[PDB]
């Protein structure tokens, strides 16, 4: 089997991407944030505290003939940005882009933090990291990809995120028309439950490539590119007036700037992030200070190849017995 679904930016900055997902019978379509940095499929629901719902579409298990309470199971998750959610669990039928999983754990939110409430466009998350990170207790549950895997033509999914445009998540096949040149594959460590890999270096603009190992995670659920302070300082030093602002929470730059590209290494291959992808616009409405799309990972504890990096590539998440990651230009 295969699936193919379009993913759409939630706003003009590509802060996140939503993908329609069919849950239950008859189908209830929710727009979920596909997140390769976590492993829970959770939704706003009829059980979510009413004051914490503001415009989201909810899953109502009582209206699904295929929903079953997973008795005794609860979940609770906290994300890198400080947001969180928690609740109980149903199993139900879940379909993405024509690919159907029966008996998928659908984690129903009883509580969500402010960031989720305030984002009316995201109806929940669909985790695509390794199932070892799944938070369901006392019986850990599998991700949608893990459940689908054996039925897929090939045990892979691909992320093809757009810059200020829709893109695609495919399951079970590699669309050879969606990228240019060849795909370069690189080793993955699953030790921390992430799609963790080691970049071979970087360049700033038209500068020379610096060969250096940068361990980090491919994370579709993180907006920005978070890299070591050394690398990030080297990037922003090429932008007149750029500075790190503790008051704002990272590097800012004059909105009048033309940003240089940033290149990262995948083996002997190179992925170029155009300068425009690194512009996250005014820090507040009407400001002439703009927020940078490359930020320091210092104090996160991990480097994160978030959407800024991933949207510059066609990315293969190969979930074969020995998983790997592939990157192609596009």
UniProtKB/Swiss-Prot annotation:
The keyword Disulfide bond applies. The active site is at residues 35, 199. It catalyses: Hydrolysis of proteins with specificity similar to that of pepsin A, prefers hydrophobic residues at P1 and P1', but does not cleave 14-Ala-|-Leu-15 in the B chain of insulin or Z-Glu-Tyr. Clots milk. Residues 17-328 form the Peptidase A1 domain. Coiled coil: none annotated. Disulfide bonds join 255-290. Its EC number is 3.4.23.22. One of its GO terms (biological process) is proteolysis. Keywords: Aspartyl protease, Disulfide bond, Hydrolase, Protease, Signal, Zymogen. GO terms for molecular function: aspartic-type endopeptidase activity. Belongs to the peptidase A1 family. This is Endothiapepsin. It comes from Cryphonectria parasitica. The chain holds residues 90 to 419 of 419 of the full protein.
């Amino acid at each position: 089997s295969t699936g193919s679904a379009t993913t759409t930016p939630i706003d003009s900055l590509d802060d996140a991407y939503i993908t329609p997902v069919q849950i239950g019978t008859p189908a209830q379509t929710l727009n979920l944030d596909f997140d390769t940095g976590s492993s829970d499929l959770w939704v706003f629901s009829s059980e979510t505290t009413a004051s914490e719902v503001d415009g989201q579409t909810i899953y109502t298990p009582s209206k699904s003939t295929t929903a079953k309470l997973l008795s005794g199971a609860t979940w609770s998750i906290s994300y890198g940005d400080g947001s969180s959610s928690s609740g109980d669990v149903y199993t139900d039928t879940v379909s993405v882009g024509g690919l159907t999983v029966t008996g998928q754990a659908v984690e129903s939110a009883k509580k969500v933090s402010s960031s989720f409430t305030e984002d009316s466009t995201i109806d929940g998350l669909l985790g695509l990291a390794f199932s070892t990170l799944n938070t369901v207790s006392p019986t850990q549950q599998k991700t949608f990809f893990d459940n689908a895997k054996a039925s897929l033509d090939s045990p892979v999914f691909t992320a093809d995120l757009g810059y200020h445009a829709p893109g695609t998540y495919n399951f079970g096949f590699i669309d050879t028309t969606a990228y240019t040149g060849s795909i370069t594959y690189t080793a993955v460590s699953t030790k921390q439950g992430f799609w963790e890999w080691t970049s071979t270096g970087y360049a700033v603009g038209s500068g020379t490539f610096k060969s250096t190992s940068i361990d980090g995670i491919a994370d579709t659920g993180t907006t920005l590119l978070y890299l070591p302070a050394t690398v990030v300082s080297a990037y922003w030093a090429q932008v007149s007036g750029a500075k790190s602002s503790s008051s704002v929470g990272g590097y800012v730059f004059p909105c009048s700037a033309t940003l240089p590209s940033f290149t990262f290494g995948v083996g002997s291959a190179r992925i170029v992030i155009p300068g425009d992808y690194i512009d996250f616009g005014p820090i507040s409405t009407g400001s002439s200070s703009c927020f940078g799309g490359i930020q320091s990972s210092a104090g996160i504890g991990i480097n994160i190849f978030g959407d800024v990096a991933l949207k510059a590539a066609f990315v293969v998440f190969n979930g074969a017995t020995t998983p790997t990651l592939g990157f192609a230009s596009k």
